[PDB]
Every structure is written in C-alpha cells, then in structure tokens.
Design an enzyme around this catalytic site. Structure first.
Site, mmCIF file in Angstrom:
data_model
loop_
_atom_site.group_PDB
_atom_site.id
_atom_site.type_symbol
_atom_site.label_atom_id
_atom_site.label_comp_id
_atom_site.label_asym_id
_atom_site.label_seq_id
_atom_site.Cartn_x
_atom_site.Cartn_y
_atom_site.Cartn_z
ATOM 1 C CB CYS A 175 -48.893 121.462 132.605
ATOM 2 S SG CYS A 175 -48.575 120.477 134.109
ATOM 3 N NE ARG A 222 -47.555 125.428 133.476
ATOM 4 C CZ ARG A 222 -47.715 126.571 132.813
ATOM 5 N NH1 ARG A 222 -46.659 127.231 132.312
ATOM 6 N NH2 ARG A 222 -48.949 127.069 132.667
ATOM 7 C CD1 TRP A 282 -50.467 114.613 141.767
ATOM 8 C CD2 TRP A 282 -48.265 114.167 141.931
ATOM 9 N NE1 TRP A 282 -49.848 115.728 142.282
ATOM 10 C CE2 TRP A 282 -48.501 115.482 142.389
ATOM 11 C CE3 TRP A 282 -46.952 113.667 141.950
ATOM 12 C CZ2 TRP A 282 -47.475 116.306 142.861
ATOM 13 C CZ3 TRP A 282 -45.927 114.494 142.417
ATOM 14 C CH2 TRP A 282 -46.197 115.793 142.866
ATOM 15 C CD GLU A 289 -55.215 114.685 134.726
ATOM 16 O OE1 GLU A 289 -54.707 114.412 133.620
ATOM 17 O OE2 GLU A 289 -54.562 114.763 135.803
#
Ligand code: HEM
Ligand code: HEM
Ligand SMILES: Cc1cc(N)nc(CCCN2CCC(F)(F)CC2)c1
Ligand SMILES: Cc1cc(N)nc(CCCN2CCC(F)(F)CC2)c1
Ligand SMILES: C[C@H](O)[C@H](O)[C@H]1CNc2nc(N)[nH]c(=O)c2N1
Ligand SMILES: C[C@H](O)[C@H](O)[C@H]1CNc2nc(N)[nH]c(=O)c2N1
Ligand SMILES: [Zn+2]
Lengths: 418, 414
Positions: free
Chosen positions: B110, B113, B282, B287
């Site tokens: 991720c 973070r 969000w 993506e």
C-alpha cells in the site's frame, strides 16, 4: 517445481531450471530483497588466486555443463579436457578456455542475465577473442574493431570482446569507462552540471589525466584503458566510428531546436564475465537500444539530463501542479521523438512494446526447451507505461545461473597508481 | 544486525532493523526470489493461539509504554484463561483499533500508508445476521464518502470461530460495476466482475444490463447462505469523466465511483482472524485511469480514445497507446477534482510515500514495502519510489488474502 502465471492470458509455466541455481539471491523466507541493486556478495571463488580445491570444482562444473550441452558427457574429449584443466591448475593456478568454451560461456552469460529484456537474441552474439592482448594500445585497437563491427553503419550487431582473465588481481585488464561511448559531465562554478551528471567523476579523472575537455553538453568521453594492472591510458575514439542520432519530433518542429542527440551503440564495459571460476574483468559487450533507456532514463531522470521542464515549456503545458500530468505528457512526446529519430536515420532501435512482447515469447521458448528462464521483474518492466506492456502482468522467478555477468568495483576505488 | 537500503536518485541510505521482527514467510528462498508472484505459497489450535496472542499483547503494551506493567501481566493472564477455557479470546476495543491501524501500517503493497494512523474503526463484532451487516456497511459507506471529502474507515465483523460460521462479504469491493458476457463473445460493463455478476443473478438479482450497473451486496453471516441487498443509490457517489481540453471525452459515457472499499481480505490480529473487514480510502488516479480503463481485460478503452485523438495506430512505435493513456489519466484527475471528490495523483502519492518511509525508518526502524506494487503502473521512473530500494517482509497484525467464498461455501437451502 514452481509455477508462474500471466494474469492477462492465464498462461501458466512450470519452472525446474531453478534447481540448478548456484548463488544466493539475497532473499530469505523472511525477507525479500528483489528491489535492492546489489543484494548479495556471494561469490563462487574468493578474492584473489584460489587454491586448487577452490578453483577446480568450479572448472569441472563448467566443463561438465559444456560437454553435457553438446551431448558428449563422459566422452573421450570430456575426460581429457578434465585431465588437461587439472594439470593447468596444478602448474599455473589457473586454466585457459578453448575457443568453443569461451563462445558457449559468453552466450550463456547473456542467456542467464535475469535483468535483460533483450535475451531472445542470446545465441546471436559475435564473440571476439582478445585474450592475446598485452597493452592499452592493443585494447584500443580491439575496442575500435568492436565498435566498427557492432555499429555496421546503423544495422547494429550484438558483440562482445573478451580481454585476458584475472590472474592474481594485481594484473587486471579494465575499461575504466562504464560504457564505450558516454558523454562527459562538468561541474559548473555556479553549482549546476553541464552534460551528463552521471559521468562527472569519470570526466574529472580524464581531465586530471590530461584530457582537454571541449566543455559542451554532448562531449564524447575518451577511452581510459588499463592493461595488465598498469596505469590507465587515454585514447580518443575516431569520431567516424561514433554513430550519433540528432533527435527531432515528427510533429513538433521546435523539438530539433533543443539540440539533443544520442549515440547509437550501447556498449557496457564495466561488468565482469564469470565462466567456470575464471573472471574476465574487461569484457565490453554491445547490442542496440530500447527507446526508453534514452527517452525515459537518460533524458528525464532528475539526476541525468533532466529535460522534462524544458520540453513541457515548449509544449505549453500547465506546469503549476503535478495532477495536470505535464511530466507524463512530455515524457511520451520525448520518447516518440527518440524512436522517430533513430528510425528515420535507419539506426536499429526497439520500442518497449515490441521489446516486451519479444521477451514474453522468449520466456515461453525457454520454459519449453530449458524448463525455466530467470527474470528480474523490477528491471524487465519498462520505466514508462508499465501495465500496458505484457511483462507487467507476467509473474517471474529470479535465480542466479552460471556462466554470468557480474558487477565489479569501479577501478579508481581500488587501483594503486604507479 | 542491520540492513541498508539506498535511494539511487538522492543517495540517501536508510537502516532497517524492524525486519528482525518478522516471523512469517515472504515466499522467497535463499536461492530463488518470488517477489513478482501475486500469491506465493481449518483454525488455530489452543497451542498455536497462545504465542500469537502473547506477541500481539506484548507489542500493544509496548506501543503504549506499559510493557511489564501490572495491567500488561493481568491482560496476558486474562487472555490465556479465555484461550484455555474457550479455545479463543476477545480483543478489547483499544486492541482492535490498534490492530486494525497496524495491519494497514504493515501493508507492504500500500502506497497510501502515510495516512495509517487516521483510520476510523467501526466495531461490528455484535452483528449476527446479513441484515445487520447491510446496516453496518451502509453506515460505513455514508461515513467514508462524506459528500466527497473521503475519510478512511474499516468495519470489523465477528472473528472466525470453527471456520464453519464465517462472516463474509462476497463482493470483492463494496461498490463495483457488473459485467455481462454477451452471446457474441463481447462483454458489457466490467469484465473483471463477470463471475460475481453471474452469482448475483442466480441468487435472484434482476440486472439492468448496462455498462455501469452498481452491483448488489451479497452478505454472509455466521456461515449461513449469503443474502442480496441493494445499496441505497443516494449513498453511491459517482463521477462522470470528462477532459479539460477534449470536449468529446464526455461523449465516451465514462464514469467511476468515488469510494474504493476492499471487502475480500482477511484481518489477522494476535492469531484471531476477521474474515469480513471491509475497508476504504480514496483513489490514486492510475488505479482507475490506467488499470480499470486500459487493462486489456477491463474496460479496454485505449483504442476508442486514440481513435478520437486521431493518432496513428498502425505501428506501436508511434506510442499511440502511451499518448492515449496519459490523456485518460488527465481526465480522471480533472473530473474528480472538479467534483470535489478526494483523489491523489501518482506523483503526489509516491512523494508522500517516500516521506512516510523515511519517517518510519527513523521512528520504527523500517517500513516493509513491495516495490512491484508500490511503483505506479505508468511513468514509473519519473516517480521517486522507482529509485528507492525497499525491503519486503511480513509483520503482524496484517491483511491477508483468502479464498473466494463461492469456492468453499457449502450451501444449505432445499
Ligand atoms: C540486442 C539488444 C539488447 C537489448 C534491446 C537489451 C536491453 C536491455 C535493457 C533495456 C536492459 C536494462 C538496462 C538498464 O536499465 O540500464 C538490459 C540489461 C542487461 N543486458 Fe541487455 N540488451 C540487449 C543486448 C545485450 C547483450 C548483447 C548483452 C551481453 C552479451 C546484454 C546483457 C545485459 C545485462 C548483463 C544486463 C543487466 C546488467 C545491468 O545492465 O546492470 N544485453 N538489457
Ligand atoms: C487513504 C488512501 C489510500 C490510498 C491512496 C491507497 C492506495 C493504494 C494502492 C494504489 C494500492 C494498490 C492497489 C492495486 O493496485 O490494486 C493499495 C493497496 C493496498 N491498500 Fe491502500 N490505499 C489507501 C488506503 C488504504 C486503507 C485505509 C487500507 C486498510 C485499512 C489499505 C490497505 C491496503 C492493502 C492491504 C493493500 C494491498 C492488498 C491488495 O490490495 O492486494 N489502503 N493501496
Ligand atoms: C548491451 C546493452 C544493450 C542495451 N539496450 N542496454 C544496455 C544497458 C545496460 C546498463 N547497465 C547499467 C548498470 C551497469 F552500469 F552497471 C551495467 C550496464 C546494455
Ligand atoms: C483501501 C484502498 C484504497 C485504494 N486507493 N485502493 C485500494 C485497492 C486495493 C486493490 N486490491 C486488489 C486485490 C484484492 F482484490 F485482493 C484486494 C484489493 C484499496
Ligand atoms: C505479475 C505482477 O506481479 C502483477 O501484474 C502485479 C504487478 N504490480 C502490481 N501493482 C499494483 N499496484 N497492482 C497490481 O495489480 C499489480 N500487479
Ligand atoms: C531501486 C530500484 O531497484 C532501482 O531504481 C532500479 C529499478 N528498476 C530498474 N530497471 C532498469 N531497467 N534499470 C534500472 O536502472 C532500474 N533501477
Ligand atoms: Zn525475493
């Protein structure tokens, strides 16, 4: 056995070749070091001249592999070769490769290079035996012939030139240049950098050795060649051997006014070739470019020519905030120009779409015939447009096979001058 | 022991000691790296649970500077009682919040973070039915969406007991679009969701058969058969995609939803397994703009966009795909920003991640990071993470993958 899956095509391949891996990767079952540049110092033979029980096992392994490769394991010639290598090591602490073994070793070092996307070509490598070389002048001659052969007026041909192997570590042959053709970089008094920032240190060594720099943005560096452990010597590559491409854009007529160019021949000269425990510390090899190496990294890295700002200005992009993607937009146009320019001058180049498609085909070939293909995803995926290339969706296994190309220290960190 | 990671752009070198705290597998061996493998490879016994619980309680009391305290020792005693008598134990609310935040902090794949300590945790461990799950999920969607000013949140349903009574959200995300295979071999909507769309239809869902049909929720409580629920349409925030310079881009009819809400992963805290734990943040623009729209297996809009851009599509070396990919991602960011829906571009997101990583190394001793996932799927080397060496290792609490429920569920009706 280990399976790799392509998440786009659902093709699954099964790897058995990794069972023959020799060196540590740096990873463990608890930590992965896959994005570390130099994760491991595990070597097959120690620092300088090995003893018999350190070298002979490595030689035997390579000779065994070579004679297996030609369906002659245990043949008369195989067993004589082992006896011969044994006596050479007994009486000289080293041994000498036959021409056929040298060629086999060089091609397999390329075939085993997990970070190389170009390996579909691995068996089409011209090998120049330079093991009779004794002086920096002779090295210059061999390198000039290599450059002329490999350039071939723009129809590039892959090649490697192999100078004498390491003996005791005090008589090394080295090319101090990182590549045969690179551009100088100069520290300016006002703090900035002119030319290629990556080569500033090497440029200063050249100037300190007597090179008179023209102090431009694209000055081809001299060769700094070390033979038999002696102090290195400067040589100017004849400019007619140095093929260069002026960079223009198929739509933006102002692009040519940026004054960019690049050289046609990528020729790595700072790596070490390891075959059967023998270390060839000078072994320049060359192929042809993938466009992104120049257009993404050389031109757009912040610590290199760093041209994104200049190009985006001329494109009239909104450069106030990152979310306008002005860097991304300029990046594509720069890479269109590089490909268009090489292609317009009939200089061999491959775009990252074609290169990555070829590599997927090469992987499939290698799994079918060899049972695997070591591949480093971090290096194979191109530095732009990653997921619209097929290698992004391809799982890969990385492991170290021999023969191989290895990194080695820069010689100015280790050389005691005379 | 120490391990150094170097940034090759800046030459900053960071020292990792946190990796000594891992005790779960990466998938690699000493001789093979499997860092690009997506998934390398019923319930814990009493003897397995004891040391897992202790490690977590120890690390929790250490984080609050109470290690060795009377409260620490009594909590350990209490936990061991529960395991001894019930074969499991129950987390305190403080421990659940700490564990959920640290599973995010520990998520090596991720890039977002830097936000880990700002997670809103909804305790849903009192839930017993699929209707209650629906209620908890609606409340989470409304809280997290916040009229476009998105807030990170997680909702934690009851933990696994014997593996026969699992809570599961069958959806992969809370909000996703349906996909329908056509008789002629084409797909309408999102191809990634064809299989889950078929399951819903079989369970009684009447599909509109459009390009952007929000899927219903398929919720499983206490190991019972899953049940269908329609998310109230006013809770689903969507963004029509337009382009700041190409007026024809809106004619493509594209839109996307504002809330990315992962619902198919498993939260492990101190040996306990939370099989239903939907969490949301969000979007990073790529993506949607790179993967959701331009993967060949997804909406696959590169050709149509390059057509309207009048690009030369006869040869790859024109880089027409690259050119179209950039414009699509400009449109996604522009559209979300114009509608005041939180989104982050990949340049801003990776810059923040480097700052986060350095802070973590300074205060925690390291930051497990998966380069293969952290580097964005476009323009990789013009983002700073490309040049950053990273170390990947598994810390717990953690988010884990788990099998899709329709592959393990044994049905009960008729
Ligand atoms: C023929 C066309 C070739 C192409 C298109 C190609 C492409 C590439 C590219 C794009 C990289 C990554 C380089 C970087 O990012 O700096 C690479 C790495 C590498 N290539 Fe190839 N290559 C070719 C030929 C060769 C040949 C002839 C050899 C050796 C005989 C070779 C050996 C290697 C090695 C050892 C590496 C990784 C080590 C390193 O660069 O740090 N390649 N290649
Ligand atoms: C706050 C804004 C956030 C941003 C911008 C962000 C960004 C991302 C991105 C781009 C990925 C890769 C996803 C993919 O490529 O499919 C990812 C993965 C992941 N995210 Fe974050 N994220 C955010 C919040 C969160 C939160 C709140 C959690 C949990 C509490 C979380 C847990 C994870 C996990 C576990 C993964 C990797 C597992 C997987 O997706 O396969 N993220 N994140
Ligand atoms: C033969 C060849 C072809 C090609 N198309 N590209 C290259 C680039 C290799 C760059 N690589 C960087 C690290 C190093 F310097 F250590 C060794 C060389 C080489
Ligand atoms: C919370 C969050 C925020 C964000 N911005 N993006 C994501 C994407 C996660 C994608 N990931 C794919 C594999 C999976 F389905 F298994 C789990 C979800 C999640
Ligand atoms: C095979 C490869 O590991 C796979 O395609 C990965 C690459 N990196 C990724 N990175 C992110 N963020 N998301 C992904 O789905 C993937 N896919
Ligand atoms: C730290 C990271 O591994 C480093 O920046 C790598 C990433 N991938 C790369 N890939 C290629 N082809 N060349 C590189 O120099 C790098 N650099
Ligand atoms: Zn690894």
């Amino acid at each position: 056995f280990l399976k790799v899956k392509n998440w786009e095509t659902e093709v699954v391949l099964t790897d058995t070749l990794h069972l023959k891996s020799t060196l540590e990767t740096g990873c463990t079952e608890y930590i992965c070091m896959g994005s570390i540049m130099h994760p491991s110092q595990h070597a097959r033979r120690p620092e300088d001249v090995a003893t018999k029980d350190q070298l002979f096992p490595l030689a035997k392994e390579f000779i065994d592999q070579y004679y297996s490769s030609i369906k002659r394991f245990g043949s008369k010639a195989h067993m004589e070769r082992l006896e011969e290598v044994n006596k050479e090591i007994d009486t000289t602490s080293t041994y000498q490769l036959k021409d056929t073994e040298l060629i086999y070793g060089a091609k397999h070092a390329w075939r085993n290079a997990s970070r190389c996307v170009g390996r579909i070509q691995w068996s089409k490598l011209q090998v120049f035996d330079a093991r009779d070389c004794t002086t920096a002048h002779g090295m210059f001659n061999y390198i000039c012939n290599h450059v002329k052969y490999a350039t071939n007026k723009g129809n590039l041909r892959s090649a490697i030139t192999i100078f004498p192997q390491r003996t005791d570590g005090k008589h090394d042959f080295r090319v101090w240049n990182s590549q045969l053709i690179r551009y100088a970089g100069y520290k300016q008094p006002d703090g900035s950098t002119l030319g290629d920032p990556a080569n500033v240190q090497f440029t200063e060594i050249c100037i300190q050795q007597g090179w008179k720099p023209p102090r431009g943005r694209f000055d081809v560096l001299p060769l700094l060649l070390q033979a038999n452990g002696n102090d290195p010597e400067l040589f100017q590559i004849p400019p007619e051997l140095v093929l260069e491409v002026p960079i223009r854009h198929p739509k933006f007529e102002w692009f040519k006014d940026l004054g960019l160019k690049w050289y046609g021949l990528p020729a790595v000269s700072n790596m070490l070739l390891e075959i059967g425990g023998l270390e060839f510390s000078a072994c320049p090899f060359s192929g042809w470019y993938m466009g992104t190496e120049i257009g993404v990294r050389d031109y757009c890295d912040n610590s290199r020519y760093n041209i994104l700002e200049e190009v985006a200005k001329k494109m009239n992009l909104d450069m106030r905030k990152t979310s306008s993607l002005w860097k991304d937009q300029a990046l594509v146009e720069i890479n269109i120009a590089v490909l268009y320019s090489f292609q317009s001058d009939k200089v061999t180049i491959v775009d990252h779409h074609s290169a990555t498609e070829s590599f997927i085909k090469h992987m499939e070939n290698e799994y079918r015939c060899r049972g695997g293909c070591p591949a480093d995803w971090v290096w194979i995926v191109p530095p732009m447009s990653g997921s619209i290339t097929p290698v992004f969706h391809q799982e890969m296994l990385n492991y170290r096979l021999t023969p191989s190309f290895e990194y080695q220290p820069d010689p100015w960190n280790t050389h005691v001058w005379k």
